[PDB]
Symmetry: D2
Subunit: 294 residues, 4 copies
Amino acid sequence: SMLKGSITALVTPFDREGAFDEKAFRAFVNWQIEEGTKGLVPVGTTGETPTLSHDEHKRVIEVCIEVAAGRVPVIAGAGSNNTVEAIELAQHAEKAGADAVLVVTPYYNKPNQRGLYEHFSRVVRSISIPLVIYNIPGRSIIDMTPETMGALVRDCKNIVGVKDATGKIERVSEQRAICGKEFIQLSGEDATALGFNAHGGVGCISVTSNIAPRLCAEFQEACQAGNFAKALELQDRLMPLHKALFLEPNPSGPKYALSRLGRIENVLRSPMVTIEAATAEKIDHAMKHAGLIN
Amino acid sequence: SMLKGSITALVTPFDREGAFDEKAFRAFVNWQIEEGTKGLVPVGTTGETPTLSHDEHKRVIEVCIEVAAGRVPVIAGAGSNNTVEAIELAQHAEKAGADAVLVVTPYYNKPNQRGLYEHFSRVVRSISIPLVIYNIPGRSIIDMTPETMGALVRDCKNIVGVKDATGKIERVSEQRAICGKEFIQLSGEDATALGFNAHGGVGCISVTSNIAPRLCAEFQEACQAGNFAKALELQDRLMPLHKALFLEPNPSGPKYALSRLGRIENVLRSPMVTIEAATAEKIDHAMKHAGLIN
Amino acid sequence: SMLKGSITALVTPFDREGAFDEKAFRAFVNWQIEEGTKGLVPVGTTGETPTLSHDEHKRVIEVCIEVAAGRVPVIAGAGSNNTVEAIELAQHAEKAGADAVLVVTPYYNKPNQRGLYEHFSRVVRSISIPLVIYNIPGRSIIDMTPETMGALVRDCKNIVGVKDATGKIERVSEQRAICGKEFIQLSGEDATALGFNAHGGVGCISVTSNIAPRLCAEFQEACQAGNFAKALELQDRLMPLHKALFLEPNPSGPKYALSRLGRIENVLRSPMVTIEAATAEKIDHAMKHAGLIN
Amino acid sequence: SMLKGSITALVTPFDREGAFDEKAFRAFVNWQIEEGTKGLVPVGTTGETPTLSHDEHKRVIEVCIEVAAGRVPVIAGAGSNNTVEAIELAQHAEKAGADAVLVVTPYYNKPNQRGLYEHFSRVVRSISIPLVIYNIPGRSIIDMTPETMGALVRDCKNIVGVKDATGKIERVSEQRAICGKEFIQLSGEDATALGFNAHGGVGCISVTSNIAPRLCAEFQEACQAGNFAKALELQDRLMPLHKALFLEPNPSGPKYALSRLGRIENVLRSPMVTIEAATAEKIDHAMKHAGLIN
């Protein structure tokens, strides 16, 4: 569809006082597109949605859509562990001109499969734009089974794919069998994007592409062209950065990395915190390996 | 000191339309106190806080405090994964007349120990009433270590105890060694409340006490008196209900059980859902075993 | 029957050349009994059974029985992931004059519940002395459910009890409900022995009792008398040693500790290795806290 | 070391009395080679090594080598949680004429990284044929880190590759970075063989290839040729069988499947047991899908 390739899970930059840095964000989103990013996810996991006010949440989406200017799809984060709240966020994303919404499995309250089916069927029926399921047991603890995901694709037209952050690559095969070959599967993990694409993925909603949008865009292009030899060469270049970016909790690593490129301030909101020196040095080394700094 | 014994993690009742059933809640809170419940936690995990609006959240606390009428402590749930939001909730709980606040580890965003330290030190310094740390890796994934908990009690006077939902009983011993004997340890799990108290717990923030407040009050009294033989007799009576209540996701089991006593409607907010018939029958059997119904 | 209280999971001492140190072992088993140990398990987890030859395996059991001289029960380790091998080990233990056998859940090959039922029913029917199930998911990965345990106690006369190393104290309650109050439950973990007994345990197959047999014997006696207040005072004394002994893989910690008492050489067989200096210092400090050394 | 492609983790057939079925095994090993299997692992996890006597262990290796007749490499299973035992097994495998040995991380006794280093360095130094590390946390619980694996490749000439059963595909990238590009990485999981190869794997030590040697050989050939579109078509054909074969514990599924092809008796040694009828029907359906039976 339009949902393929390297799609950046955008950091939300803050200034030296913790306010939304709209100026850095505008320049950053433009840089991303110039470097070959195929899509943008504002206010996701990596955007520190939890610490944004309701107004900041709306504003980051609006600015993201305005700078994109139709050049690349905007898949707005619209996640909540409250079905009524996720409806409101998804409708506001659509009204604001989002191309699609990314809707996480409810976190903290740990619903069963019936509850997941109800949550996703009610959210997608509230809107007219495509919905991507965001399955991340490592943050929501519960796990949408391929069977539940199949029931939702069968029953709901606008459920078009998954951000699959299970890190269990056999799921790509099971989801392909049950949801079909047209079901849009996007890696939710940078380090396993390569194998994810071999099992039938068509892209990655990426943290690393915040830092290396061009190499990540080329890596994804290589996978979609079937040039796995080139993709593996690019994996050898990026894997140190895939690893170093996650030594500390996301998006501490990415925000340090983007500050080291001079593009944002190294600032996060409690309970997220700046990385220690030792992490910062492993991220610098990984950025040299990848050729992003001399 | 007032934080001892059986403390009910209150369900939030909804009517046949999903509105706050204030009438059922008032009668329920009163029944709980009459049956010997030693404290109340409104808008905690079992209260479906995620699906309450800001106004419903305020109202459940206000009504809880009003009905309590100083007869037992009210420990208001005041959790967020956003430090600024948790400050605002804790201050509002204090202004409303709460005796203390229960503040969960940030869920979803997975901060490190420094982030936890910052979160809890800023929340407790924003207020003048006691704070209880709520450590629940099974919902927030990350885990406040005894060491980090010790640092917070050492540095912050008004951090007075923990709701410990780790299910790892050796933590009670480690928290007692590092946080001290005066540190108030309350079981976050019904089924291991007994062993929890043997290691130095002085009570339980309980789901089962929603259904069997009097037997739960006696069980806790027996532990605090040192009559572990009586506590074990009461465990033989309560354990099938401890188990049957959690066959399906909390608080679906409890809400069915309380509807079977005629005290609420069997109604939850998406993505939480009513239990299957088979579960309902295992909860009826466990309630018969405990002598709550014929 | 006489399976109660502090039962030592004996280390197998090696000399400076890696041979079985039979002289240190005979003095150690005698010391254990003199200090009030209520039972002995030779060639278990803590005995490095995997690195003993078939002849060394037979000899450690024989020496244990010879020194015991009927003063305390010997529960010989007779564990294998091969049912035919476990039959042969249990029969050899019985012929050698063991009072009972400790038989682990098969490790590595990960059988289902039917396979566990078959394993334990065939081994216990091969012998005429009591059998204790050893349930340790932390080493064998699979987990005998309370239901499977129930089936085995119900159907096999000589299956009398469990060494429960799940660390999940709600299992003691579930096993008591299904297997009955007369079913002999022994903690498989030192740090949760206390809570284990509160839920209906009658003792602990202990690592710590290798080092502090007398304090561990008194702690267990206190629990069996219903003096949980005294048991908790003894927990305050023992918990730093419970922790320091397991900083590094069992039995590295215990073997260093027993060498520091002058009772064995600090020698293990590959792939087990001696502890680091730093660990050794945390073990010394824990031994001072407990009053075992000046 | 042309250890590449589909390498079968051979079942050990037993007759209706539980004895080694040498006649079925000879015909099976020959069939495997005729169908394009590139290598053979006798007496591995899938061969029920735990339940083989010392003489049966030697015999299955000897028959495997004799039937192979130099046509494909034989990588003999030589695993133990005892370093001295693993030495003896590896030397005997070499004396019998094995091309290489597969040596599992010690199970049950849970050594640290020093213990793993010592275990593998002593085993490989005892022999003069190549050694493949078998890293399987799902059976041994402990996990050789890429750093420990790199130390062993740096220090030990004959450590040539890994059977990687972590199911964590980012390990392939990390092992390639630290152990180098010539380090032979073989998938330890059938379901993720495809992505494993995309990250730099050159084959799979396979369970499924017991049942579909030809399709598994083609799948691996497609990956090694860089035809990932063909490999993915073959994944769509094999994945239901990759799943159905592991509904019940390995090798109960494979043994039923091979009995349904008429090639062995459906017979396992305790504690492994024949699959239920229900599983057998899901395996039949998966075998129909793959075109192995009508």
